């Protein structure tokens, strides 16, 4: 419809939360490359900290990006429904948690550890390196719309 211009303030390949936000693409998807954030959640975040969703990730102020970061780290007290979070309800403190960055993998490992420590069957399967879901054992897993 209308063509913009802008100048050398554009900063592609910037980083946030131990990870590189990819430049020259829509901001939602750029966020999505982070461990602990996916598409829907990213979209939600964008809606919340109102960024122009047509605009690319390499633009935009640092204060704004830190608002986004704040939202991502502190979702439940910024009026996000509390059924949306990944590690919902939790098994220690008893409050909702959106695990984020490289901490999600660490947190995952911690879960996988505690299972083995507990000695639940699933834990034993994990220890053995087996198909853990109790599904019909001959798997790869795929692929429709």
């Amino acid at each position: 419809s209308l063509v913009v211009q802008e100048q050398g303030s554009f900063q592609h390949i910037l980083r946030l939360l131990n990870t590189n936000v990819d430049g020259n693409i829509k901001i939602v998807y750029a966020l999505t490359t982070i461990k602990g954030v996916g598409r829907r959640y990213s979209n939600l975040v964008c809606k919340k900290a109102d960024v122009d969703l047509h605009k690319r990730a390499g633009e935009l102020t640092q204060e704004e990006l830190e608002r986004i970061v704040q939202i991502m780290q502190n979702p439940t007290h910024y009026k996000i429904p509390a059924w949306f979070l990944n590690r919902q309800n939790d098994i220690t403190d008893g409050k909702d948690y959106h695990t984020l960055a490289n901490n999600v993998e660490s947190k995952l490992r911690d879960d996988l550890e505690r299972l083995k420590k507990i000695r639940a069957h699933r834990g034993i399967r994990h220890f053995w390196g087996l198909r853990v879901r109790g599904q019909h054992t001959k798997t790869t897993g795929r692929r429709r719309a």
Partner: protein, 70 residues
Amino acid sequence: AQHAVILDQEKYDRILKEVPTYRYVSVSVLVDRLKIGGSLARIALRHLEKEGIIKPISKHSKQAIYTRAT
């Protein structure tokens, strides 16, 4: 990463210049010379339609199609 996504500055001017010299224009032609990405290609096409220059014998999205001013 073939790129040519954001307009920069001089590449917009270049587009303004070299668009009317073409016979055929579309999203493919405006990425063919390693020019502006799909988004901008569409946007810019709509603009060039708005500001004279190219005359539409077009139809819809995906396959856009315009011609020179005559």
